[PDB]
């Protein structure tokens, strides 16, 4: 069902500090090799009056797993999985995300709903002072019959130093599938291209699981 090459289609409905938008995208990659690319367009409420980098992390079927760590999110398909995310930014900004992943007609289908609130109007998010994020290591652990990740995402500030978020995510297969033990996923998300007002953006992600 999950081929060595897979396309996906994504739709996001979102608001950030009350600004409503829609995003449509098309992605592709090699699920077993742990890389993928995606192209997004802001179809409604563009240009976005806030930093793209808060939306960049909103595709876990494309993580490279060694043979001895069960690839829980791949084993969910074809029915697929849901994920729920809370991002607690250092200046009090909050992002909540829910996501449905499924497999239709040989491609992944992603539906995302996002709410950001409480970003300071003078902060780096509403003032677009971020230039992408550092590589991260998401700590994965099973709990309550689901897979959980925690990370600390480090957004790059133009003038030097970082703007940080605590991120907790829950990934749950729609049908009981084998959960792994606790492990680590090294991730690098790159914005590879964008038009001037970030209404069109291209992103490259690499993700590899490994033991602690």
Reported residue count of the chain is 212
**Residue 156 placed within a domain:** yes
Is residue 1 a part of any domain in this protein?
no
| Residue 162, marked binder | yes
Other C-beta atoms closer than 10 Å to the C-beta of 33 total 14
Best CA proximity match to 53, nearest among 158, 125, 120: 125
Is there a binding annotation on residue 143? yes
Question: Residue 42: inside a domain, yes or no?
Answer: yes
Quote the CA–CA distance of 107 and 78 in Å, as a whole number. 10
- Residue 82 falls inside a structural domain: yes
11 to 30, 42, 61, 105, 117: CA distances (angstroms): 21, 10, 17, 17, 20
- SS3 (DSSP) at 129: coil
Residue 165: CB atoms within 10 Å: 22
User: DSSP per residue over 39-72, as a string?
Assistant: EEEEEESPSPSS-GGGTTT--GGG-B--TTS--H
208 annotated as a binding-site residue: no
Contact 46, 199 (CB under 8 A): yes
For residue 211, say whether it is annotated as part of any ligand binding site. yes
* Domains held by the chain: number: 1
SS percent in the chain: helix, strand, coil, step 5: 5, 60, 35
Structural domain including 196 reads 6-210
Q: Is residue 72 part of a domain?
A: yes
Q: What is the DSSP letter of 181?
A: -
Q: Is the dihedral of CA 156, 157, 163, 169 positive or negative?
A: negative
Q: Is residue 55 part of a domain?
A: yes
Tell me the resolution in Å. Answer: 1.9
Is 19 part of any known ligand binding site?
no
Q: Specify whether the backbone of 113 is left (phi greater than 0), alpha (psi in -120 to 50) or beta.
A: beta
- Tell me, what CATH number does 176's domain have? 2.40.155.10
Q: Are strands 6-16 and 107-117 parallel, antiparallel or unpaired?
A: parallel
Q: Which of 11, 36, 30 is nearest to 192 (CA)?
A: 36
Cβ burial 89-116 (10 Å sphere, 16+ → b, else e): beeebebebebebbbeeeebebebebeb
């Amino acid at each position: 069902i999950i081929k060595e090459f897979m396309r996906f289609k994504v739709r996001m409905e979102g608001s950030v500090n009350g600004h409503e938008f829609e995003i449509e995208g098309e992605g592709e990659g090699r699920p077993y090799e742990g890389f993928q690319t995606v192209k997004l367009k802001v179809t409604k409420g563009g240009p976005l009056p806030f930093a793209w980098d808060i939306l960049s992390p909103q595709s876990k079927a494309y993580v490279k797993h060694p043979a001895d760590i069960p690839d829980y999110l791949k084993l969910s398909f074809p029915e697929g999985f849901k994920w729920e995310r809370v991002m607690n930014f250092e200046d009090g900004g909050v992002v909540t995300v829910t996501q449905d992943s499924s497999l239709q007609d040989g491609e992944f289908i992603y539906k995302v709903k996002l709410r950001g609130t409480n970003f300071p109007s003078d902060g780096p998010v509403m003032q677009k002072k971020t230039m992408g994020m550092e590589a991260s290591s998401e700590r994965m652990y099973p709990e309550d019959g689901a897979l959980k990740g925690e990370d600390k995402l480090r957004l790059k500030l133009k003038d030097g130093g970082h703007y940080t978020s605590e991120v907790k995510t829950t990934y749950k297969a729609k049908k009981p599938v084998q959960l792994p033990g606790a492990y680590i996923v090294d991730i690098k998300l790159d914005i590879t291209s964008h038009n001037e007002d970030y209404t069109i953006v291209e992103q490259y992600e690499r993700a590899e699981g490994r033991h602690s």
